[PDB]
């Protein structure tokens, strides 16, 4: 359920002559890829993940102090 904007396809690179946009080539491979990944975690990673909201959940953490 993760997703990322890689950019705007450079077939649109001339929508305008200047725009604040990151034009990238269309993917040259298959549009769908299936990969076997063996993923490791530790019981401590589970401790940390269950004790407190982590990463992009904990945006207020940017304030530091408490």
């Amino acid at each position: 359920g993760a997703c990322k904007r890689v950019g705007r396809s450079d077939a649109y690179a001339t929508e305008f002559d200047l725009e604040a946009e990151e034009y990238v080539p269309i993917p040259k491979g298959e549009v769908h890829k299936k990969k076997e990944i063996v993923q490791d975690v530790t019981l401590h990673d589970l401790d940390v993940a269950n004790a407190r909201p982590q990463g992009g959940q904990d945006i207020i953490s940017m304030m530091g102090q408490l």
């Binding site: 077939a11 649109y12 690179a13 001339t14 929508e15």
Partner: peptide
Amino acid sequence: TNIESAPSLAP
């Protein structure tokens, strides 16, 4: 009937 011409909208 010479209505076979086609325009485009891609940049």
